[PDB]
């Protein structure tokens, strides 16, 4: 599913991402935009063989199990397929654990290079929340 900007912002807000561990809702909307362009079925095979899954492109090397990644630590304790649903619950829950790690949102290259340092609140402006 390809989310609409405000549709996703509202969903993420309901899923408790606004100000989660210090990150305003805009950061998450922006991260999803640049990681997958709001596409929950997004998938990218990495160089090391691992694969990024979902709207937040969570990697199978550390976070989920896709049964084809030798290193896979499956820190989020879920099959990567759960991250390809139009129901963002699984991705959000995993994202929360990820961000609870030392790197914070820095775990997402797209957020580090396209969102950090900018007016991320712009991503939720005009949305009724």
């Amino acid at each position, epitope marked *: 599913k390809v989310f609409g900007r405000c549709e996703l912002a509202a969903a993420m*807000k*309901r*899923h*408790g*991402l*606004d*100000n*989660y*561990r*210090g990150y305003s809702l805009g950061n998450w909307v922006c991260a999803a935009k640049f990681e997958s362009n709001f596409n929950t079925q997004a998938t990218n095979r990495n160089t090391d063989g691992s694969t990024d899954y979902g709207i937040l492109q969570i990697n199978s090397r*550390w976070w989920c199990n896709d049964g084809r990644t030798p290193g896979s*630590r*499956n*820190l989020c304790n879920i099959p990567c397929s759960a991250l390809l649903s139009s129901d963002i*619950t699984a991705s959000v*829950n995993c994202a*929360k*654990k990820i961000v*609870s*790690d*030392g*790197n914070g949102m820095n775990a997402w290259v797209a957020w580090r290079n396209r969102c950090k340092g900018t007016d991320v609140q712009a991503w939720i402006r005009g949305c009724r929340l």
Partner: antibody
Amino acid sequence: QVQLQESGPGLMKPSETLSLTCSVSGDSIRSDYWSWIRQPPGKGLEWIGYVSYSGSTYYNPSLKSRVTISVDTSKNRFSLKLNSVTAADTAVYYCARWDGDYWGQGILVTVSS
Amino acid sequence: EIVMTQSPATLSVSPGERATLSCRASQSIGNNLHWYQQKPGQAPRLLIYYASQSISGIPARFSGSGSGTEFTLTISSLQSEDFAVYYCQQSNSWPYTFGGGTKVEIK
């Protein structure tokens, strides 16, 4: 089946350093986030801190830098270190997975002046 | 830190009766509120996570609702084994904090 188990001194004197360990079975210590929580007798619950997969730690400011949480991947366990203990530190100490899904049974630690 | 306040401190319930426990956050925490049940001499057991998500193995009579700063744990028809102290806990902000607890006891 996942099982956490706390172990350490049940009695100590003030100013001493509390050392506790939590051994895990049925799950890999290096494949998750782990924490410590305590409950003073007759009181509620207070988070002590947790350590994530990258080794980064988060400590409760209420402890005022007297706490250390570390991991011993070789023995699939993690520990808690609390310096300069006083009666205010008497409590049942629990270890648990970050997600809160699994908890140790807790260990009573009494600091006797 | 975010202050979590539970009410009532003690809740008397007759077996079979509905039980409603409240929890409030000093500031908005979205859906980052988890409920635990703690029986004497035992560690708290997670019942509900992220305000309303259920855990496998947990009786259907346990249900959580609410968002922002007001949350509720409902036991549709309390059974005698449900007597215990219940705690809410937020994970939106570090340090994570627990409410003061609600002691549910037989009436």
